[PDB]
Amino acid sequence: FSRLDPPEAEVQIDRLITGRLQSLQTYVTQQLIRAAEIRASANLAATKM
Amino acid sequence: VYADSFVIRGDEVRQIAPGQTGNIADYNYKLPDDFTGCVIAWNSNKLDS
């Protein structure tokens, strides 16, 4: 925010923000796939029990 | 529509644009960061000097 002037300050902090949103999106997608795998494994324990 | 009008020295015409530092753009006339309009500048050496 400090050095770059206002017209392209955004042309940079949107880059940062969408990059971090992409990182969060990747983490969330990985967690949804892993949770599906666990739920597949969790239902093989309810049946075994 | 509105119309601000004034006269400045040449070297300072760069400070008018949105978000700049210096004497003119911080002590005399400051444009909002989120400007929406135009700016005009024509040499007036004979008329105004």
Q: How far is CA B2 from the centre of its chain?
A: 15
How many Å lie between the alpha carbon of A7 and the closest alpha carbon of chain B? Answer: 8
Closest-CA residue of B relative to A9 is B19
Kindly state whether A1 is in contact with chain B, defined as any CB-CB distance less than 8 angstroms.
no
Resolution in Å, one decimal, please.
Answer: 3.4
Residues from chain B that touch A7, judged by Cβ atoms under 8 A, are: 18-19
d(CA B49, CA B46): 6
SS (H, E, C) chain A: CCCCCHHHHHHHHHHHHHHHHHHHHHHHHHHHHHHHHHHHHHHHHHHHC
d(CA B23, CA A44): 74
Deposited experimental method: cryo-EM
Closest-CA residue of B relative to A2 is B19
Residues from chain B that touch A6, judged by Cβ atoms under 8 A, are: 18-19, 33
